[PDB]
Design a protein around this ligand. Structure first.
Ligand code: CLA
Ligand code: CLA
Ligand code: CLA
Ligand code: CLA
Ligand code: CLA
Ligand code: CLA
Ligand code: CLA
Ligand code: CLA
Ligand SMILES: CCCCCCCCCCCCCCCC(=O)OC[C@H](COP(=O)(O)OC[C@@H](O)CO)OC(=O)CCCCCCCCCCCCCCC
Ligand SMILES: CC1=C(/C=C/C(C)=C/C=C/C(C)=C/C=C/C=C(C)/C=C/C=C(C)/C=C/C2=C(C)CCCC2(C)C)C(C)(C)CCC1
Ligand code: SF4
Ligand code: SF4
Lengths: 737, 152, 90, 41, 160, 31, 80
């Protein structure tokens, strides 16, 4: 199912911009043509109506994405070998700050090459690559150079594959629609075999090298990874069970492998991370489970399941026919699959962000506060963006590919017939949550201002205790020995076990208390999430029609309005709902990251002394100061911003410059959001007049930006400015202290 | 002493600023071995700072009460290098750029589809036009005198 | 399957009483007689509004005027000596 | 190739080349003559 | 196949749906017996019942959450605040009745049942009926507040 | 004095209610 | 109700009547253009004011003009 040489390789189409569209290829009468060229670059569905060609175009771009990712990985690995102090950091991870970037001295920018330890001058990095390299057994820079070379080779291979599968042998449509085979392969081979290979690498390389490192041996005296394979005596000395070979595995005497395959739980006191034996056992079990899961769906040999057969058998007295017809929708529309995958990926990213901080998987990662904060905020933002994109593409599918005549589905029909109740109930829930979550903050502020601290919602006057979460913490703290007999310690130290882990005089992790403030902040999170969901679902559900504009589907997915009639019809399209929900996503993620930062700085992170007294960074003021808006403004925003505003003249002045630059970018966006196109089109007419006077009027007539373009520019600049401000503030605050 | 200012070479605050910067730079040098590359970089930075301060002292700038140089733009001949000469150089360069752009725009105005020559530049024609802007003042003045500069 | 009628537009436009009940009064005649006898004067909407305004104005004002400092902290007044302001000001 | 030369004359590529050469020239000029505040000649 | 959700009264072009939440026999019986749905009874008695029920309710939040909750004057202040709220609600009802209904006009309530049977329209949707309802509501609210205060702070019942 | 204990509630609670009721009746009127 | 007017610069291409979301505009015979037609607005009480007619006029400035005016229950698009 491939075609030989579908499209000739030529430079002819390079010299004719806009060849993908008939209208754009005509020529640039005005300046709107240039903007329209870029906005429709990757909309393959608008270029042609053939599903096979769209699938072939989609298949090739992923190869370019993979090549770009491989180039990025190659650069990251190469910079750590040539412009880094990784070897010096390896001998003292607790007193040296990782750095992998140096700057050329031209205009006085060499001040950014601050001292970081190990006789090195550079920029301190917070991506956590040093911990990953240490956990993999990497010791010298030659291995990093080899990894960079391999990544370059893989990027070249990906680029060649991308060219080949589009210009020499393009698969047919019947190849793409083999969902059962694709699922079987991506489950058994992509995931299970990868987990098995990583488990093997961890067993044979990471474990002995990491044990030698934790023993305190000089990294230059540790035997090379290949010495543990050729010389089984070394492994037998390290692990006696290796002397028996693979015989216990094939005789089901798996108890002999308990030395390097454990079920301990908790953190390693030496490094502050999870035990590597637990990780190896976890990867082995996950590989087995994924290998089993990949033999469910039917193929050329009869045995297995048919996804259509599974779907068609589920229906209920409330839902009618049920899931019949969903198989044909998901195997014919690219947008629905994209929306579902984007939503699932965003949720998974948020879950990963939440899980990484409380269960540190890398050595010397819990005590690196900047890395933890950066990873948390980065992954949360990525998850939010993916979640928004899911709804955007769901609306796109609803507008374009919906067709009840040939693709009828009962479940989709029933949802669209009672959307008013869903929207009204969601509106009521949002209003109730906003009143009963944010209103308690204003009450506390008013009572504090009036001089009545005894009438506030606080731990000392009127308690609002999160009794349900405390019960979960108590249950999980008592899990070992009762409901998890095979475990020695709890999964996390934050459950409330009472034990504290200190590495290098710093607090890695300890139980986290929950009080009245956590109740309020959690309900604030719920309120913001509910409002965002309301906006996106209202946008998706009313994409085709409404009581105001019955024929909204004919106007398309991205149109500005339908005139000033009916009192005003501004921003009625589904695109405008995504444009509006991006702001609320930004708001929710900012509140969440502020909560995380303040809570960790106030109740977890700190230093321990010889007598064992913990002194936190901010002194534990979160409980009594976060219950008012004035407290958030004073003890968090005003107090913690002194690091970034006093960074001039030092190696951290770049963050100080980025603070003001992001301020300017954020403030600059309000011009596009608060104004309209007619004023700017009328203003241009006067500017064109004087150019005509001096014979400098261009033939490409200048036109003001369209309404949609202006809204997009405004939202983009707004988001960029806000995120850059928060990034600069966080990094400047956390690197110094 | 215009507006109560003092020369850089006679200002004590200027020397204090130089000493403070040099002392701040020398503090980080003690953390590294003399043969190490960061020591060489810090030595070069110190030498550059000393050279910059000496050059500022030599050029006859005026310092305020804070030990910072100030610029006089009123037209005094003693300070024609701060504003006048760079201004003339900038005016010449900007006139060159504008004249080249206007000439290129005028040249392609008679073509069948002039908008096509604006997104895809006719490189030989532009290159032949680029060198012409070196004498832009004379051409502009004579075009003004003949009444060609302003569209009718 | 006919849902349109011109001689009967009440059913066509859905003018129905979904939960209205036509059952007789379940209350006791004596209790009902007592309630109509004693609650009658408040059934005049012209006089009820004026009575409510006058009663609310008189009752709210009387309570506030005769309030004791044990209830309102502002009726008690300050109980501590004052402190001088900046630059030695009162 | 005529079509390859045509693609090199498009606005973004030409602008990128011009600005890269310009930035290189300016960086080299500032490297040769650092910390210039007044025109001394 | 058996289906649960049905169009309202068999007419699929009216903007409503019949669901177990709306058309369950228990819920249908419960709602028809509320004083606000007894269209064949004197509005004064229904207003009295509604006022009593709502006035008994309003005492508790004012008493337990008020600024004087931790003093000896908690109950009296809570009862006074509840009475004030009842007075405000009575004023609102009177204003709504004056603004919405005009004297001499017939009732605007529907005169058709769900099964098509004809019935007398409710008299609550007239000026006189609404005035009677408001007076009964005021009387019942004051009486209920007084009863709640008497039970809570005149008889030493072992509450809580 | 004792005047603020009367005029403040009289201006802040009674007069606004009277004005709002009268204005609502006036704007809801029809002929 | 809104006000809709037609001016004698009409060319009678029937583009406005086809874009009308309600039944407001129509075509009548005329003399003065090649097409021998001109538009008309007999049902302006159904006008909503979305101004789709002006988006379809090919004449330099519009031969059909909509002036927003007193709002009714029909011109506000309410289905309460
Ligand atoms: C794709 C990601 C990526 C990114 C963001 C960077 C970024 C950087 N690299 Mg780089 N690099 C990458 C991939 C990447 N590299 C790869 C894949 C390789 C080959 C393995 C290199 C090999 C490399 C070398 C050999 C050097 C850099 C240098 C630099 C820095 C100066 C860039 C410069 O002047 O170029 C200007 C742009 C041109 C096109 C020239 C800059 C921080 C330089 C540096 O840090 O020196 C102090 C330097 O010497 N890089
Ligand atoms: C795909 C992953 C992978 C790969 C390529 C290998 C490869 C190898 N293993 Mg191995 N191994 C793996 C996973 C893997 N293992 C896992 C998950 C376990 C845990 C059950 C083991 C446990 C194991 C033992 C106990 C021994 C090997 C040995 C060996 C070597 C001889 C066969 C060979 C290099 C043998 C060896 O080191 O001989 C030199 C040996 O004694 N392996
Ligand atoms: C797997 C991820 C994925 C994929 C494959 C797609 C794919 C697609 N999306 Mg999409 N989208 C995604 C995620 C994704 N999206 C997410 C997460 C969101 C939410 C933010 C959206 C929101 C979204 C909208 C709102 C729209 C699409 C549209 C489209 C289609 C046209 C794309 C196009 O023309 O863009 C062209 C690409 C660009 C113009 C580049 C944008 C430049 C960015 C925004 C600025 C970057 C700033 C940068 C840092 C500054 C450096 C500048 C430099 C020059 C100096 C295409 C099928 C469009 C569509 O289907 O219309 C019918 C459409 O309207 N998407
Ligand atoms: C060579 C082309 C050219 C020339 C001769 C002029 C000349 C003029 N412009 Mg102008 N302008 C240009 C391009 C040009 N503009 C472009 C591309 C833009 C869009 C960014 C503008 C935007 C603009 C505004 C917004 C305004 C002017 C104004 C003016 C007048 C005041 C003088 C001045 O310095 O304004 C300031 C000039 C600028 C800020 C322009 C920025 C410099 C551009 C980027 C140079 C680009 C040149 C171009 C690449 C030529 C390529 C040549 C190549 C093919 C060989 C003057 C007549 C002002 C006026 O009096 O209103 C009529 C005014 O308010 N211009
Ligand atoms: C600007 C005018 C104004 C004035 C004078 C007051 C005065 C008062 N407010 Mg208040 N308030 C105002 C505006 C005002 N408020 C506004 C604009 C808001 C909204 C932001 C609030 C929100 C508010 C809350 C949330 C609370 C108060 C409370 C109180 C009382 C303080 C506690 C006390 O003494 O309990 C003693 C109270 C009593 C002994 C009973 C109530 C007083 C009278 C006797 C009730 C009956 C009055 C009358 C018959 C009914 C109204 C008549 C009508 C014409 C107005 C006090 C009477 C507190 C309180 O206790 O209210 C009940 C309280 O919890 N206020
Ligand atoms: C590390 C070695 C090295 C050295 C010694 C130089 C030296 C020089 N470079 Mg250079 N350069 C280098 C690496 C180096 N470069 C690299 C790696 C790049 C990036 C690919 C560049 C990109 C670059 C650009 C883009 C330019 C220079 C220019 C120059 C000259 C500036 C003086 C001048 O304009 O006078 C006049 C020139 C000379 C006297 C001799 C040439 C000078 C000779 C500039 C130049 O030559 O101006 C015309 C210039 O525009 N360089
Ligand atoms: C219109 C505004 C403006 C003006 C007139 C200047 C003027 C100047 N800048 Mg400058 N600059 C500006 C904006 C401006 N800058 C902005 C916005 C930035 C941030 C991107 C910079 C960043 C900058 C640097 C990094 C340096 C200059 C330098 C200089 C001096 C140039 C010395 C030389 O040989 O060339 C000159 C006085 C150089 C210098 O030595 O200054 C004394 C120098 O190293 N500038
Ligand atoms: C526009 C002018 C003006 C303004 C802004 C105020 C503002 C105020 N007066 Mg006031 N007052 C005014 C004219 C004004 N008065 C005049 C002309 C008289 C008659 C001489 C009074 C007599 C007066 C008394 C007797 C009291 C106030 C009080 C007050 C304060 C509480 C509000 C109140 O009870 O209203 C009452 C306002 C009036 C009766 C004015 C009617 C005209 C408030 C700051 C009270 C106070 O001090 O609270 C602490 C208070 O007890 N006023
Ligand atoms: C209400 C309880 C939760 C819902 C519940 O009982 O779920 C189950 C219930 C019955 O489902 P059925 O058995 O009819 O169909 C199950 C489907 O998987 C068949 O494709 O769902 C509904 O009737 C729709 C509920 C929509 C959402 C209602 C508000 C929440
Ligand atoms: C880091 C990195 C890199 C590299 C990588 C690598 C180097 C990898 C490797 C990998 C590997 C190297 C893998 C492997 C694998 C293997 C496997 C997967 C196997 C399997 C086997 C099996 C499954 C078996 C089974 C069995 C049974 C069951 C029964 C009978 C017996 C036997 C044994 C046969 C690069 C440069 C790219 C860049 C980026 C980053
Ligand atoms: S009003 Fe416009 S579209 Fe209609 S006939 Fe006249 S010119 Fe044509
Ligand atoms: S404004 Fe809209 S409704 Fe009115 S005539 Fe024009 S198209 Fe029809």
């Amino acid at each position: 199912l491939v075609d030989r040489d579908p499209i000739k390789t030529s430079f002819e189409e390079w010299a004719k911009p806009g060849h993908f569209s008939r209208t754009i290829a005509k020529g640039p009468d005005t300046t709107t043509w240039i903007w329209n060229l870029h906005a429709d670059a990757h909309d393959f569905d608008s270029h042609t109506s053939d599903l096979e060609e769209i699938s072939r175009k989609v298949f090739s771009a992923h190869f370019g994405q993979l090549s770009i990712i491989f180039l990025w990985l190659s650069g990251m690995y190469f910079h750590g070998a040539r412009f880094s102090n990784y070897e010096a950091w390896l001998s003292d991870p607790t007193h040296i700050g990782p750095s992998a970037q140096v700057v050329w001295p031209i205009v006085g920018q060499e001040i950014l090459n601050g001292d970081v330890g190990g006789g090195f001058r550079g920029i301190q990095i917070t991506s956590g690559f040093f911990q990953i390299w240490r956990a993999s057994g990497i010791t010298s820079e030659l291995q990093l150079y080899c990894t960079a070379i391999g990544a370059l080779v893989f990027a070249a291979l990906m680029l060649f594959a991308g060219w080949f599968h589009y210009h020499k042998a393009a698969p047919k449509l019947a190849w793409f629609q083999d969902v059962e085979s694709m699922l079987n392969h991506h489950l058994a081979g992509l995931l299970g075999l990868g987990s098995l290979s990583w488990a093997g690498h961890q067993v044979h390389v990471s474990l002995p090298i990491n044990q030698f490192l934790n023993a305190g041996v000089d990294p230059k005296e540790i035997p090379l990874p290949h010495e543990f394979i050729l010389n089984r005596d070394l492994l037998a000395q390290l692990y006696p069970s290796f002397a028996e070979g693979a015989t216990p595995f094939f005789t089901l005497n798996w108890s002999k492998y308990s030395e390097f395959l454990t079920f301990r739980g908790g953190l390693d006191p030496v490094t502050g991370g999870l035990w590597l034996t637990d990780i190896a056992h976890h990867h082995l079990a996950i590989a087995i489970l994924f290998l089993i899961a990949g033999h469910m769906y039917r193929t050329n040999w009869g045995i297995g399941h048919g996804i259509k057969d599974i779907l068609e058998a589920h229906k209920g007295p409330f839902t009618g026919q049920g899931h019949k017809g969903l198989y044909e929708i998901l195997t014919t529309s690219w947008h629905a699959q994209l929306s579902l995958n984007l939503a699932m990926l965003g949720s998974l990213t948020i879950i990963v962000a939440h899980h990484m901080y409380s269960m540190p998987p890398y050595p010397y990662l819990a005590t690196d506060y900047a890395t933890q904060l950066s990873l948390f905020t980065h992954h949360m933002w990525i998850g939010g963006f993916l979640i928004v994109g899911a709804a955007a593409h769901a609306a796109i599918f609803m507008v374009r590919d919906y067709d009840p005549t040939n693709r009828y589905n009962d479940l989709l029909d029933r949802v669209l017939r009672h959307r008013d109740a869903i929207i009204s109930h969601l509106n009521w829930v949002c209003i109730f949550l906003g009143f009963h979550s944010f209103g308690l903050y204003i009450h506390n502020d008013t009572m504090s201002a009036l001089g009545r601290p005894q009438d506030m919602f606080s731990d000392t006057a009127i308690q609002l205790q999160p009794v349900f979460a405390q019960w979960i913490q108590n249950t999980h703290a008592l899990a070992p020995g009762v409901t998890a007999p095979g475990e020695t310690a709890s999964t996390s130290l934050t459950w409330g076990g009472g034990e504290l882990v200190a590495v290098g005089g710093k607090v890695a992790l300890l139980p986290i208390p929950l009080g009245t403030a956590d109740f309020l902040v959690h309900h604030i999170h719920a309120f913001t999430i509910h409002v965002t969901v309301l906006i996106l679902l209202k946008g998706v559900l009313f994409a085709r029609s409404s009581r105001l504009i019955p024929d909204k589907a004919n106007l398309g997915f991205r149109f500005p309005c339908d005139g000033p009639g009916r009192g005003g019809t501004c921003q009625v399209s589904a695109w405008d709902h995504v444009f509006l929900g991006l702001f609320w996503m930004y708001n929710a993620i900012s509140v969440v990251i502020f909560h995380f930062s303040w809570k960790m700085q106030s109740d977890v992170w700190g230093s321990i002394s010889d007598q064992g007294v913990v002194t936190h960074i901010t002194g534990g003021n979160f409980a009594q100061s976060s219950i008012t808006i004035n407290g958030w403004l004073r003890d968090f925003l005003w107090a913690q911003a002194s690091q970034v505003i006093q960074s001039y003249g030092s190696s951290l002045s770049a963050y100080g410059l980025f603070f003001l630059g992001a301020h300017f970018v954020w403030a600059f966006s309000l011009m596009f959001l608060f104004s309209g196109r007619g004023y700017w089109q009328e203003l241009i007419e006067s500017i064109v007049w004087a150019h005509n006077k001096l014979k400098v009027a261009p033939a490409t007539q200048p036109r003001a930006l369209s309404i949609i373009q202006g809204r997009a520019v405004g939202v983009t600049h707004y988001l960029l400015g806000g995120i850059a401000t928060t990034w600069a503030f966080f990094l400047a605050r956390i690197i110094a202290v | 002493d215009i507006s109560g200012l003092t020369p850089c070479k006679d200002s004590k605050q200027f020397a204090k600023r130089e000493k403070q910067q040099i002392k701040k730079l020398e503090s980080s040098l003690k953390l590294y071995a003399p043969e190490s590359a960061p020591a060489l970089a810090l030595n070069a930075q110190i030498e550059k700072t000393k050279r910059r301060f000496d050059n500022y002292g030599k050029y006859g700038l005026l310092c305020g009460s804070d030990g910072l140089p100030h610029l006089i733009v009123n037209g005094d001949q003693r300070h024609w290098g701060e504003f006048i000469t760079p201004g003339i150089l900038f005016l010449y360069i900007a006139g060159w750029i504008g004249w080249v752009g206007r000439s290129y725009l005028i040249a392609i105005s008679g073509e069948k589809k002039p908008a096509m020559k604006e997104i895809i530049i006719d490189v030989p024609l532009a290159s032949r036009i680029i060198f012409r802007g070196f004498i832009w003042p004379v051409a502009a003045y004579r075009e003004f005198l003949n009444g060609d500069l302003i569209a009718k | 399957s006919v849902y349109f009628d011109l001689e009967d537009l009440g059913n066509t436009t859905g003018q129905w009483d979904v939960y209205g009940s036509d059952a007789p009064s379940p209350y006791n005649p004596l209790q009902s007689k007592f309630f109509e006898t004693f609650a009658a004067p408040f059934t005049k909407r012209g006089l009820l509004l004026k009575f409510l305004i006058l009663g609310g104005g008189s009752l709210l004002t009387y309570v506030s005027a005769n309030s004791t400092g044990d209830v309102l902290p502002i009726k008690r007044g300050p109980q501590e000596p004052p402190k001088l302001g900046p630059r030695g000001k009162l | 190739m005529r079509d390859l030369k045509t693609y090199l004359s498009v606005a973004p590529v030409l602008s990128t080349l011009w600005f890269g050469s310009l930035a290189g020239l300016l960086i080299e000029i500032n490297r040769l003559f650092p910390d210039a505040l007044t025109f001394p000649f | 196949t058996f289906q649960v959700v049905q169009p309202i009264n068999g007419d699929p072009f009216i903007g409503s749906l019949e669901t177990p939440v709306t058309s369950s026999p228990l819920i249908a019986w419960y709602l028809s017996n509320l004083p606000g749905y007894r269209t064949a009874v004197n509005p004064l008695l229904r207003g009295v019942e509604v006022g009593l029920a709502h006035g008994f309710f309003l005492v508790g939040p004012f008493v337990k959450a008020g600024p004087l909750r931790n003093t000896a004057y908690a109950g009296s202040a809570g009862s006074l605040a509840a009475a004030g709220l009842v007075v405000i609600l009575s004023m609102c009802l009177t204003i709504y009745g004056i603004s919405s209904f005009k004297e001499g006009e017939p009732s605007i309530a529907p005169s058709l049942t769900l099964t098509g049977r004809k019935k007398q329209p409710d008299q609550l949707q007239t000026a006189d009926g609404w005035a009677k309802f408001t007076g009964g509501f005021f009387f019942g609210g004051i009486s209920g507040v007084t009863w709640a205060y008497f039970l809570l702070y005149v008889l030493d019942l072992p509450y809580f | 004095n004792n005047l603020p204990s009367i005029f403040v509630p009289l201006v802040g609670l009674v007069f606004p209610a009277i004005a709002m009721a009268s204005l609502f009746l006036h704007i809801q009127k029809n002929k | 109700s809104h006000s809709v007017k037609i001016y004698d610069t009409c060319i009678g291409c029937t583009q406005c009547v086809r874009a009308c979301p309600t039944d407001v505009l129509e075509m009548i015979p005329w003399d003065g253009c090649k097409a021998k037609q001109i538009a008309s607005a007999p049902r302006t009480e159904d006008c909503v004011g979305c101004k789709r007619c002006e988006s379809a006029c090919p004449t330099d400035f519009l031969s059909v003009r909509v002036y927003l005016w007193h709002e009714t229950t029909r011109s506000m698009g309410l289905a309460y």
